[PDB]
Assembly symmetry: D3
Homo-oligomer: 233 residues x 6
Amino acid sequence: ATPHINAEMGDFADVVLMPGDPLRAKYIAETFLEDAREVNNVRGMLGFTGTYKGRKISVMGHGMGIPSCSIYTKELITDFGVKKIIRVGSCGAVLPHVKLRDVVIGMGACTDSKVNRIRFKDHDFAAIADFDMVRNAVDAAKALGIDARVGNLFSADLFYSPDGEMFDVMEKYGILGVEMEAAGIYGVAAEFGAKALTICTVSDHIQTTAAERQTTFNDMIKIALESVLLGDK
Amino acid sequence: ATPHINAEMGDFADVVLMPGDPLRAKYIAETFLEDAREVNNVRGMLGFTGTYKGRKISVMGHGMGIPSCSIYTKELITDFGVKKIIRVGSCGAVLPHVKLRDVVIGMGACTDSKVNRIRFKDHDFAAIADFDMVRNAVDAAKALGIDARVGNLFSADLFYSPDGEMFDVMEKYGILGVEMEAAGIYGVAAEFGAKALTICTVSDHIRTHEQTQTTFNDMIKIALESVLLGDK
Amino acid sequence: ATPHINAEMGDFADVVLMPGDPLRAKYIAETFLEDAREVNNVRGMLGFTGTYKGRKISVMGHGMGIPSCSIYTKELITDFGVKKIIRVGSCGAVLPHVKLRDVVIGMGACTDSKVNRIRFKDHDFAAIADFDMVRNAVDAAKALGIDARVGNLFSADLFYSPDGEMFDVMEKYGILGVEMEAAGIYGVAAEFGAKALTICTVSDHIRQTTAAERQTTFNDMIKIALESVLLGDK
Amino acid sequence: ATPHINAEMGDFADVVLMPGDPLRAKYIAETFLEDAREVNNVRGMLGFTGTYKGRKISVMGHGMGIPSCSIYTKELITDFGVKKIIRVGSCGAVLPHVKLRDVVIGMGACTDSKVNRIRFKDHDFAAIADFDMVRNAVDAAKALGIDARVGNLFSADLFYSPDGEMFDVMEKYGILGVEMEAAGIYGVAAEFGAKALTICTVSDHIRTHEQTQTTFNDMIKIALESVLLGDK
Amino acid sequence: ATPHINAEMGDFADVVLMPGDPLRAKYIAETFLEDAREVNNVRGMLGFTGTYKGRKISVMGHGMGIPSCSIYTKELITDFGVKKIIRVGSCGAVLPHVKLRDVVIGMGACTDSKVNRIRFKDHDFAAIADFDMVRNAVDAAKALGIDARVGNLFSADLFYSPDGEMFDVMEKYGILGVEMEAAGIYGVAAEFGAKALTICTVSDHIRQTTAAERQTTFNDMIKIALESVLLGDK
Amino acid sequence: ATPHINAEMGDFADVVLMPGDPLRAKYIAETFLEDAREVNNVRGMLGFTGTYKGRKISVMGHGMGIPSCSIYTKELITDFGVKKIIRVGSCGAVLPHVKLRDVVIGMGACTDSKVNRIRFKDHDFAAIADFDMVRNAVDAAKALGIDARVGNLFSADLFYSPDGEMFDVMEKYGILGVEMEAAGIYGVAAEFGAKALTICTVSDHIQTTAAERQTTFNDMIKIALESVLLGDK
Ligand SMILES: Nc1ncnc2c1ncn2[C@@H]1O[C@H](CO)[C@H](O)[C@H]1O
Ligand SMILES: Nc1ncnc2c1ncn2[C@@H]1O[C@H](CO)[C@H](O)[C@H]1O
Ligand SMILES: Nc1ncnc2c1ncn2[C@@H]1O[C@H](CO)[C@H](O)[C@H]1O
Ligand SMILES: Nc1ncnc2c1ncn2[C@@H]1O[C@H](CO)[C@H](O)[C@H]1O
Ligand SMILES: Nc1ncnc2c1ncn2[C@@H]1O[C@H](CO)[C@H](O)[C@H]1O
Ligand SMILES: Nc1ncnc2c1ncn2[C@@H]1O[C@H](CO)[C@H](O)[C@H]1O
């Protein structure tokens, strides 16, 4: 076991899906995985393991913010043999042509955090996803008849920002969605030699009907799961 | 109800104790509060309200990291009439003479986060606690016969830091405990107009690697008793 | 005409290939393009326009460094209707498993320049390429039986840096190659709403080949870039 | 004798009061000290040692700016056995409710200087005072029936700043007084291992432009009396 | 030979004049130098060596931007024994009293580049020229009946900057002209122990002339630079 | 009068020499000026005015550090009609070929202070002296048979620096001397439209006989005074 995960090697699959909400992780396990079992509950951060179409897969929450998800992704990679991390969350949109319920894939992630500068000697480290994982997700989406936008996300440290002018800047440079973790996870993946990807559904435009929104969230999860199978080939 | 808390004005007391672990909040409600009731569980971040010596009080977790606690403390202050926030967490020691189980009070908090530079035009904002709340905690401690050091804490963004040399700098400048929220909470209290204090129990030693419920009991009692003193 | 390009709207195709060495531009025009015509000579930065399998294509050098390529890419985008920019150059490697003559594609580009911080209020802007262009290049390379690595490049402001320690850091974070323009071009592309991609061939390992081997590798990179454009049109 | 002070170990008391103005140091020695003797005058920076209620005490100016006071406080600490430094200066107010003659105690000090970033690996060091010394001053104040606010001060490098908008940010974050030494003194105390506190008297108002010897008397008495309390 | 200069020790004089535009190098060699001979052609950056009133002098372009000129000046200094570098180019003005075609000498150079901070542990390095070279140029200009202004230049990384507000700041602090290399060359000179100077003619005012007037002004700048070298030899 | 100077317009000459030590200002006035009178004593920062070979000249201390000298130079320029400021002080040497008692002239000044970044939008402002003043001083020195080095000075915020490695950096980039004011004064001169120059004598090598040292300090003052007369022509 590690400081934040009370499990043992083998308890997790080599691929982990990670929503921010622990209750969302349980929702994913019950809805999409067969023969699922809980493998962690420390601090209430529920994690599970089961199978999808015969493939062993895990899902665990990572909390809100770069500092939080950095702890969990690091531990999974160095102590549980995890090779791939796929964040599945929500984001706010800044571009007008980006519509509610669009599926966004973060090929890269900008940020106002200092963690990567601390890692890269105060220079600019381009926090990017793994190319093959991005490709698998785009292909899985197409196979499901879904339109997926591929571009830059912005990982913010402050959900309630005092600098409102930074949103015009994000829009000017084409940022597709605003969330709070991608840049941190990509930094961890580079530091410890693993692979990561972040996929989001637009929840607000910096909301339609519950039925349609819930349908889109499920499509995102399907895209994640099916992208893994493609990668296996 | 706010984006991360499903409750209404009046559900929380005007003072809230906050550990990072939501499970410890539950433990605190069950162990120290009278007629405790759950007032939130969105994202599993348990919150409770009850009484201590007839005084109404709430306890809710805030998660790990400045970004996480900044969301909860802000919502409590602007939409639930909360006036005082007391963080009751754990930390890692860096000084030779600081032992496990020691209780530290952060009058100030250093950090490697950029949040305060963003608020303060890229200059140095001294993230400090409310003086009266600090004094209240020191006195409570004495009345309970429990020792407690007052000084600077260090709020880190990376629990697993790639810069190990920075611990020598922390030690050199007298950092009492390494945690991940103080500087953030102090920044929010200043921006949104409330008062705050962070108290911690050394649960691990960064140099020796020693590791430790119930261990936080002295800290928890100091926090609760300090509120009573503040009311007078 | 612009301050550095003496031409008019229409003289350039909507896609432009750009090597660092100006002399490579005329070579590409005569070796790979049909019915080529000269469209620029200011400061000796020769530009050409012709067709590749019926597709309109232009080629012109960009000079060494972020400040230089930033001028040319900006003018092409805002005044000549250019939609895509493909830089084709060389780089130096720090990873042991990356070999001389290897072809690398920069999906992202790190840098020690201050240009993007100036654009992004002093925060971290992830300088990235257009995803489809990246995928097009990968597929074109595979069709030519060539294996290409996709990852991060590092755009240095100083070819002769006083900080040797930085190369260890680049290796630790998986940087595939070191050059001097990618992050600058990606910033311009985001600023003015266009698309860009950087392809490089490993010319040296920061830590030999025949003159004929180098031309073979260079010609391979150009074929990849050109065929990648056609796939993108599909 | 050090590079900027011509005296020997024993000439200064273990506690030293320090105004920026050397002429005010002289005024303090003549007005509040018993059998005061001059122990330095290099560069005109007057220093004196005498007694207050039988207690040995020194008072010496430190000049204007963080670079100036960093030299004097360092030399006193490393070569004259000085253990406590109490700055007794003036400041400009930025908040509407802070009036001229008000006494402020800086538990913390913000700054636009780079000195602390140079000491702290370019991160945020919370420049804070010694808790006990702060408490001593608050109590002394009460015993004398004088009001005093406890909070953050701002130590500026430029008295004539080209960025007037920064005053709005200072006000927004509750800065009690604008001066030029606090953050520097607190950094030196931490680096060289001593204790410090800065007390100030609002002598001008940055917004209203109002301007004010003898005006610093309440402050001076609070400082001297706080030392006595500290000795017990 | 170095990575960007195919020549050997001795091919270059100990003093080198450098324009940004490579084409200006051949012009200077044929218009002002005697018995000139070609010494470099790599990447089309032509270099020449000859004599001016018996004094050995070389001329070669440096390209646009700090990263480009930093490569050439570094190699000339460490591998070809060059002792002095004189950049001769154009700049844009922000001060109302500074006129088109005015000759300005940069005793110092401000910048928005990060190169000197990388060299100076993130502190402020005052990028300055060699004092005697500055005085030599001033005296040479006066002897030619030309009035020259001496002050600060500003070396920009982005010709097309997204921050228009910065020009007001430059005007407030007395910046004489805006170009893109001075601060980079001054940094290299300090790093490897050599001397440098930048002379520019105002080609535009950030806020016209005949083609003949421009050649007259350009030729005036070269005469000043060349005569300044001879005064320096005294 | 101003906040730190209790005098009136006319009390100062349009050229002011400024040592760091107020007692040094009095020493300069008594030694080199005729019919000198004290024109300020606020906070003990003595200032004087008299004449040198018939030329009206003033001399006043500026205290130690950039924050201190910035206050005084600013007030002199905006409220007393001062056109030129000449700092006359001491510095520590980092270069081996730079010898004790050498006279150094700061054409430029590097610094670890943030004041100029605050002024220049966080960019690099090259803090330089006025060219004509530098020239006048070099010529005045030559006329006195003195060798004067012209180059970069380094204005430090901390006399007792915690970063000892920065001295190797200063030496590598050719800094001639280390002091604590030049960069601040040059910044003030640029902000308010005046002219400034800093001249120093090497006091230590990061000391010979008192007689020879005192002789060199006086040569520096002579250079300053005579450079003014040359400028008048
Ligand atoms: N408008 C917004 N700003 C910042 N983060 C936003 C956001 N909308 C959604 N998120 C994501 O939701 C969580 C924080 O509430 C996740 O932590 C975050 O990724
Ligand atoms: N050695 C250490 N370094 C950093 N944070 C530590 C710590 N010891 C305890 N904490 C606190 O515990 C949580 C992170 O595990 C809380 O998020 C954090 O405040
Ligand atoms: N080892 C290296 N470091 C930096 N740039 C290198 C390089 N090897 C190749 N390049 C590319 O070649 C030009 C600079 O010489 C181009 O400007 C640059 O992209
Ligand atoms: N409005 C203000 N801004 C800055 N410093 C002020 C001030 N009012 C008083 N001080 C203090 O007085 C000296 C500077 O004149 C001391 O150096 C300084 O601490
Ligand atoms: N207005 C301006 N802004 C920036 N650089 C300018 C300029 N006017 C002239 N230059 C000089 O010309 C080249 C860049 O076009 C040289 O590279 C540059 O020195
Ligand atoms: N070694 C050194 N480091 C920094 N400043 C030095 C110095 N040697 C001399 N100075 C100058 O002397 C005064 C500070 O004591 C002046 O304030 C300063 O200019």
